[PDB]
Design a protein around this ligand. Sequence first.
Ligand SMILES: Nc1ncnc2c1ncn2[C@@H]1O[C@H](COP(=O)(O)O)[C@@H](O)[C@H]1O
Ligand SMILES: Nc1ncnc2c1ncn2[C@@H]1O[C@H](COP(=O)(O)O)[C@@H](O)[C@H]1O
Ligand SMILES: [Mg+2]
Ligand SMILES: [Mg+2]
Lengths: 236, 236
Amino acid sequence: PFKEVSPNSFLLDDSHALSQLLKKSYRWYSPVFSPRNVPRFADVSSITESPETLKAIRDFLVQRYRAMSPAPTHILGFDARGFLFGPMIAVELEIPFVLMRKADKNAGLLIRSEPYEKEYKEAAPEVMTIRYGSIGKGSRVVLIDDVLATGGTALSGLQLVEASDAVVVEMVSILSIPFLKAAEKIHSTANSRYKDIKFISLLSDDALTEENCGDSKNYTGPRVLSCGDVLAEHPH
Amino acid sequence: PFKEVSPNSFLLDDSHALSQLLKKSYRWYSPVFSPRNVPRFADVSSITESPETLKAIRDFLVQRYRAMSPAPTHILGFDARGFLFGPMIAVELEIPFVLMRKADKNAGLLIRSEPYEKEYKEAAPEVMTIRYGSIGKGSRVVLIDDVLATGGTALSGLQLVEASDAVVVEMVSILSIPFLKAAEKIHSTANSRYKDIKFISLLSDDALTEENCGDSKNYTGPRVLSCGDVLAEHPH
Ligand SMILES: Nc1ncnc2c1ncn2[C@@H]1O[C@H](COP(=O)(O)O)[C@@H](O)[C@H]1O
Ligand SMILES: Nc1ncnc2c1ncn2[C@@H]1O[C@H](COP(=O)(O)O)[C@@H](O)[C@H]1O
Ligand SMILES: [Mg+2]
Ligand SMILES: [Mg+2]
């Protein structure tokens, strides 16, 4: 079950089969082996390429929401890694899966989020959107993405569900980076207006060790190879 | 069943329940109501927000590959709309779901595609990637995305599977735009080297009429509204 690690922020107990499987399957990469500049980039492919792990996530979340009452009415996944988990849950629960994307990616009349100023060190916040009317008054929305880091995207989700006159069931993430204090910051910002927002995570990045490092050991070549160069490595 | 509309290009017969449902659920948008400059932008949300339609797609493709022999070993979905359909099929078939994305989005050692020169009128081609070793020698990969238009992305998929010493089972798309002749062009380019590549589509855009137009009738406001402006339209 989920244990409260901090106010309205829950983590699956590490004895659960799902937590074990995620700990076993997850692979992280350092800067020279990833597309982002963070110490450890958690690769979502290490999860989607794992049939046993993907099904365990689907089974668990589907059982969670089917047992939930009042039951959720919508699943809102974040572009693009949230798209990998949302649909398989929504197809089982038989409720709509809504897409949160930048305006230049979404169709129809849209509603845009209002991110906070970037607190130095750059890292400009993303303005996200959902189609106007995709989520109606009285809807109970489950927000989903792969990794909860600073919480900037989660906040965009909250604002959009709020603006739609709907309520957030909870923000769910496969992995959370508790060091960046997303739940805490979101829970106290703007005079605790989002204090009631529940955050659930299936695994903490603190559970990831060097054993989860996907970096190529003793490698000195480039990170990216063309098709032609790879084709030359084998008979064809 | 699938009917051959042209060499190695199949379309689901329009009497099938799935084809009917897609025809009923699909919504398209003109430029002032979409993020792209094409006459009719097929909104994938009109499908994902439709529980009945999403499940029908999942059921059909899952039954197709379970009855297939030799059975597929991998599903390669295109960033980001291919991510919406691939995982729910892969979780059922119990095979890995690999991600095709730009290098600045993928982790690990990557293999990049080699797109052709843009044939005037601009529209610069995208260099796509998959992690080196995500698909091995002897793999049988199903490529998937929502809309098959010019085929530039599909070709990136073919090149990557080819470079990995694996074979393409088929390129599957929810919707195809037969006017842009993707299957034809891919089938004859480079001395018909991709002539054997099968293309399957669940619906042709020719089946979409004005009844599928999602444009707001007699609307004159902006396409995008902020959260604050929408919040002001209702008591809170
Ligand atoms: N260490 C990380 N590994 C993988 N993805 C990350 C990492 N840190 C941030 N991201 C992601 O970037 C998105 C934005 O994070 P956030 O700062 O919580 O808005 C998240 O959904 C994750 O996909
Ligand atoms: N009319 C359209 N509606 C929606 N998406 C489109 C349309 N035309 C092209 N696209 C997309 O842009 C991607 C690239 O198309 P392609 O030209 O086939 O490489 C496709 O996967 C579709 O998602
Ligand atoms: Mg995100
Ligand atoms: Mg694409």
